A = this chain, B = another copy of it.
Amino acid sequence: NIGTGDNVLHRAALCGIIELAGKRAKLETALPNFQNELNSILELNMTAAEPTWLDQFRDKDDRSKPRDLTKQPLPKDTNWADHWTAWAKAALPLLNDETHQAKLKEYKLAGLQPEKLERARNTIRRLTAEAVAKAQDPTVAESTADLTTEEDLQKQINQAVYSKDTEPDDDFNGYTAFEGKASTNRQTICGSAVAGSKATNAMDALFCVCADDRTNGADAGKACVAGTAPGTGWNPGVTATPTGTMLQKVRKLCNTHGKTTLSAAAIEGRLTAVGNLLTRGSATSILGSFLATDCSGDQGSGMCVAYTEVTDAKGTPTKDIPWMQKLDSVRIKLQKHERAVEKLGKPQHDLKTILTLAKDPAYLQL
């Protein structure tokens, strides 16, 4: 008969999912953001430019103000319209002569007399072109496109766990278990050797695996605990949908008190830990202790949840069980984010190198 602790294995696997939800899943990768360095190189290039070049960025009446493109259109016989936004950004602080002199000092160009500035300028223009080619590389934008957001990933995880964008509070306000489709009795709600459950997410699966009910507190209702049953008071033969208080008495078996470092490997391990616990039969697969007939919560029956989507003849969880597919999508997105973070560290180092060289007066003359 099913008794105390018989579902500890399954509880652990499902809580490894639950604990990811809320805002607890964290992208601690940070990001290689090299825009600061690129902007500095472009500003250094403008600072070293011939004064008639910086003069193109000035208003013809107030030389301290930026050129307006209606008042002074960019000549059609140039490619200046393709490059103006970045040029004007680099020029804007330099329109102030005192700021231009301050930047000349910041970039180690203020000791240069005209012919020596001309020489350095050639090297700076070359380094600047190389910086743009490295940082504007379509592959850089490719990696940047594969960068995910903690908010987006957290939303998808809460969809897998709760079918909501956010984790329900401790009263489960706004949440209805089994999407309002619970009926009849525990075995109808949780499934059997022939029928699937009414669960659509990981939380409600955990509830079927771990909740006690009115009839099994002395025996099977202790399957996920030690000494004392959860005490849900669930009476599904009379009132099929458990209340929020009931759900929380099961969720509190899981660690909602810490954080998890999001990595594809971590998600993969957690999904496999559930997926291979599914006991594949002819018509359903069962998660949880099962002895006979159905997941009715009786000690001679089962404390479990059943799925028709995978059996001993078909189906993989990450494709065919919706909540698990949703979580596998997070693993996929994380793998791409991880590859992008690695790739983007290269232009970051390269831009730092170029800025070091561009600020080295001896190299520029060389």
Chain A interface (Cβ < 8 Å from any Cβ of B) = 4-5, 8-9, 11-13, 15-16, 19, 122, 125-126, 129-130, 133-134, 137-139, 193, 224-228, 252-255, 257-259, 261, 263, 265-266, 268-270, 272, 275-277, 279-282, 286, 289-293, 302, 310, 312-319, 335, 342-343, 345-349, 352-353, 356-357, 360, 362-363, 366
Copies of this chain present: 3
B343:A349 contact, CB within 8 angstroms: yes
Name the contact of A16 in the complex, choosing from B4, B253, B276, B343 (C-beta under 8 A): B276
Smallest Cβ distance from A130 to chain B, in angstroms? 7
B130 to A357, Cβ gap below 8 A?
yes
Question: What's the Cα separation between A257 and B280 when bound, in Å?
Answer: 12
Kindly identify which residue among B276, B291, B335 contacts A4, using a CB–CB cutoff of 8 Å. B291
State how many angstroms separate the Cβ of A260 from the closest Cβ of chain B.
9
Chain B nearest Cβ from A312, distance in angstroms = 4
Given A266-B268, A315-B257, A345-B346, A225:B279 Cβ within 8 A: yes
In angstroms, Cα B231 to Cα A282, docked, is 12
A-B CB contact pairs (8 Å), 25 listed: A5-B290, A8-B9, A8-B277, A12-B276, A13-B276, A16-B272, A133-B357, A137-B349, A137-B356, A139-B348, A139-B352, A224-B279, A225-B281, A226-B279, A226-B286, A227-B290, A227-B291, A252-B313, A253-B280, A255-B280, A257-B314, A258-B319, A263-B265, A263-B268, A343-B345
In whole angstroms, what is the CA distance A276 to B292 when docked? 28
CA A270 to CA B265, docked complex, whole Å: 12
5 A-B pairs with the lowest CB-CB distances in the bound complex, closest first? A258-B316, A226-B290, A12-B276, A252-B312, A133-B356
Which residues from chain B contact A318 at a C-beta distance below 8 Å?
258
Are A137 and B281 in touch, CB under 8 angstroms?
Answer: no
The answer to whether B15 touches A276 (Cβ under 8 A) is: yes
> What distance in Å separates the Cβ of A337 from its nearest Cβ neighbour in chain B?
14
A363 with B227: CB separation less than 8 A: no
A135 to chain B, nearest CB (A): 9
A366 to chain B, nearest CB (A): 6
- Chain B: CB-nearest residue to A280: B253
> In the bound complex, how far is the Cα of B257 from the Cα of A275, in angstroms?
12
When distances are taken between beta carbons in the complex, the residues of chain B under 8 Å from A366 are: 122, 125-126, 129
Select from chain B the residue with minimum beta-carbon distance to A273.
B12
Contact: B279 with A353, CB < 8 Å? Answer: no
User: A125 — nearest CB in chain B belongs to which residue?
Assistant: B366
| Nearest Cβ on chain B to A304's Cβ, whole angstroms | 8
A280 to chain B, nearest CB (A): 6
CB distance A291 to B5 under 8 Å? Answer: yes
Min Cβ gap A14→B in Å is 9
Nearest residue in B to A331 (C-beta to C-beta)?
Answer: B261
Q: How far is the CA of A289 from the CA of B265 in the complex (A)?
A: 29
